[PDB]
Design a protein around this ligand. Structure first.
Ligand SMILES: O=S(=O)(N[C@H]1CCNC1)c1cccc2cnccc12
Length: 102
């Protein structure tokens, strides 16, 4: 039942308007300084790979990766950058949906 909501909310974040910065890993060959500043990158496809393969034990583990996406987003991107402003839309969305199941 737990991982059924994670399926719903990852589906909902994967198809969200604001999801475009987070759908695929950051390419550090293209984003100068990313490799150095972000110790543990995370993106929605890696969570999808991990969920489909079954690599989540609970909803907490799933939610940690989701929050690491947005924690990384705020570390690397200015709150008013385009990725930044998208990041806040996604984080608020995730925070909300998560709380209206738990
Ligand atoms: O959205 S990006 O344009 N690239 C996306 C598309 C390809 N994989 C990631 C981008 C550019 C610069 C910094 C970023 C930091 N976090 C996420 C995305 C960032």
């Amino acid at each position: 039942s737990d991982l059924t909501f994670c399926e719903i909310i990852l589906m909902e974040m994967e198809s969200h308007d604001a999801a475009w910065p987070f759908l695929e890993p950051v390419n550090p060959r293209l984003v100068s300084g990313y490799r150095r500043i972000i110790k543990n990158p995370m993106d929605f496809s890696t969570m999808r790979e991990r969920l489909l393969r079954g690599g989540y034990t609970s909803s907490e583990e799933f939610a940690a990766d989701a929050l690491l996406v947005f924690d990384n987003c705020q570390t690397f991107n200015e709150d008013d950058s385009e990725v930044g402003k998208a990041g806040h839309i996604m984080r608020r969305f995730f925070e909300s949906r998560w709380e209206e199941f738990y």
